[PDB]
Design an enzyme around this catalytic site. Structure first.
Site, PDB file in Angstrom:
ATOM      1  N   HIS A  93       0.764  -1.245   0.000  1.00  0.00           N
ATOM      2  CA  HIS A  93       0.000   0.000   0.000  1.00  0.00           C
ATOM      3  C   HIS A  93       0.802   1.307   0.000  1.00  0.00           C
ATOM      4  O   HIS A  93       0.197   2.366   0.154  1.00  0.00           O
ATOM      5  CB  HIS A  93      -1.012  -0.003   1.178  1.00  0.00           C
ATOM      6  CG  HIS A  93      -1.979  -1.147   1.151  1.00  0.00           C
ATOM      7  ND1 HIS A  93      -2.911  -1.309   0.155  1.00  0.00           N
ATOM      8  CD2 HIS A  93      -2.161  -2.186   2.007  1.00  0.00           C
ATOM      9  CE1 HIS A  93      -3.624  -2.400   0.394  1.00  0.00           C
ATOM     10  NE2 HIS A  93      -3.184  -2.953   1.507  1.00  0.00           N
TER      11      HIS A  93
ATOM     12  N   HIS B 178      -2.814  -2.300   8.210  1.00  0.00           N
ATOM     13  CA  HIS B 178      -3.934  -2.685   7.354  1.00  0.00           C
ATOM     14  C   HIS B 178      -4.444  -1.418   6.672  1.00  0.00           C
ATOM     15  O   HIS B 178      -4.436  -0.347   7.281  1.00  0.00           O
ATOM     16  CB  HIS B 178      -5.027  -3.310   8.236  1.00  0.00           C
ATOM     17  CG  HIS B 178      -6.345  -3.494   7.561  1.00  0.00           C
ATOM     18  ND1 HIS B 178      -6.593  -4.519   6.672  1.00  0.00           N
ATOM     19  CD2 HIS B 178      -7.509  -2.810   7.684  1.00  0.00           C
ATOM     20  CE1 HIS B 178      -7.846  -4.451   6.267  1.00  0.00           C
ATOM     21  NE2 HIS B 178      -8.422  -3.423   6.868  1.00  0.00           N
TER      22      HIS B 178
END
EC number: 3.1.27.-
Length: 120
Positions: A11, A112
């Site tokens: 990410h 996350h």
């Protein structure tokens, strides 16, 4: 803190140039997300310290049950799988965006990314 490392791999991309379909198809390969093809995946751009700051009140608020939402907006790119197959070759449609992000934090590090805010 290998979950932090995993977060960065999946990410984080400091400085892309293009952020087009080709960018998605390349970076999804580079980051090991094409076997099987991930349905949707978002990369955050800029520096790391702004993203870590989401885990503090410096750049974050608590959010829903166990998440943090950023105060600043980030340049992001969402890669969305195009076509019928879960398996390579993985064709991706790119959407460049600019907004705040939702993450989960552990020991002051993001571990996350909540992908739901980019499913559109």
């Amino acid at each position: 803190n290998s979950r932090y490392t995993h977060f960065l791999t999946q990410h984080y991309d400091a400085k892309p140039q293009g952020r087009d379909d080709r960018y998605c198809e390349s970076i999804m390969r580079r980051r090991g997300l094409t076997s099987p093809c991930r349905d949707i995946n978002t990369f955050i751009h800029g520096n790391k310290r702004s993203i870590k700051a989401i885990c503090e009140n410096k750049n974050g608020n608590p959010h829903r049950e166990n998440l943090r939402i950023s105060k600043s907006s980030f340049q992001v790119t969402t890669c969305k799988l195009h076509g019928g197959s879960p398996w390579p070759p993985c064709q991706y449609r790119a959407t460049a965006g600019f907004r705040n992000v939702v993450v989960a934090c552990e020991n002051g590090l993001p571990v996350h990314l909540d992908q739901s805010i980019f499913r559109r």
